[PDB]
């Protein structure tokens, strides 16, 4: 039931990071297409992670022409907010993770988590000025 | 962006049978409970087929539940009726695939999907009556 | 320690036989005693099974014995009716499992069930004209 479950992530691990650290769905989507688009159409998936997306992306086509079609209907600005406020938090986040699980690790991504949770967890007097600003170390 | 693309398969080729030739999807559903409820469940994917049926489990309940939403918010049957009709017929067709390839295996489906095409779609102008009856075999 | 742990299936596989498939009582009893009854009159099993049908025949006397004695003690002869459509069906639907296990095999009962689902989700238009009409193969 976890889509996490597969790469070792669960949504209890997933509950640290707020939803506003989550960069927009456009964004993801964009960062997809410019690097693993055409891993996404070759034939060979190469990696759990690219199947995963390829289903995903699909999926979020399919909503975006259900948002369409109920624009149509009647209404859609209160439509589009809740599917941004429940799905589309779930949809970016997934897509978040398996995007940076694809560009550094799955396990880095695992660390990076729980470096995030125990600095958000921290109140600010403990905590360090700076969350990780995560950047791929050169 | 194909689907069945990595599985070798083509949007095409399943449009060559008939749309109503697939089951209803709580049929679908229950038939993947009962069958690889505890592998689908599995830390592990143990295959593309496992992974793909995640994210479309996930997927059908997350547009059940915006289904369920719009009926309390905002067309209430004309939108439940859209969703059977364009993408509920996508998803019950990839379930009902994805269940048979993880059941009698993949090129067990395709054949058993060309076999049902040729089956129907030769006009009988000077195609002899002679035709035998469909069935799927594991 | 699945009702049918032991046994492989579950009752959830047992789920797509629809209610009617399933014998009426007398012919299961009929067919235990035609063909394993002495094998259920030694204490010695020889298998699972046939502790499985001993418990399953004594609990299902125990039953008819409740049932007359509700008819006489305390819709008495309404009952009847209650239980039997209640859980007469469960200990038709368990009999009949124990005796296809006992004559054609355990596994070779789970291909059929599945076989016997896969035909039924087919919509009758698709649907081969008859079902895999189970009897003792050569």
Redesign the interface.
């Known amino acids: 039931?976890d889509?996490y479950?597969?790469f070792?992530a669960t949504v209890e691990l997933l509950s640290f990071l707020p939803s506003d650290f989550f960069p927009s769905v456009r964004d993801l989507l964009d960062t997809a297409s410019a690097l693993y688009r055409e891993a996404?159409?070759?034939?060979?998936?190469c990696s759990?992670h690219?199947?995963?997306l390829?289903?995903?992306?699909?999926?979020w086509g399919?909503?975006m022409?259900?948002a369409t079609?109920?624009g149509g209907?009647?209404?859609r600005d209160?439509?589009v907010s809740?599917?941004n406020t429940?799905?589309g938090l779930?949809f970016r986040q997934l897509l978040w993770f398996h995007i940076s699980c694809l560009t550094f690790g799955r396990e880095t991504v695992i660390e990076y988590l729980v470096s995030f949770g125990v600095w958000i967890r921290t109140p600010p007097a403990y905590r360090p000025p700076n969350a990780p600003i995560l950047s791929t170390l050169p």
């Open positions: 039931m889509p479950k597969e070792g996404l159409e070759s034939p060979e998936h759990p690219h199947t995963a390829r289903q995903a992306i699909l999926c399919e909503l022409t259900l079609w109920v209907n009647l209404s209160l439509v809740y599917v429940n799905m779930k």
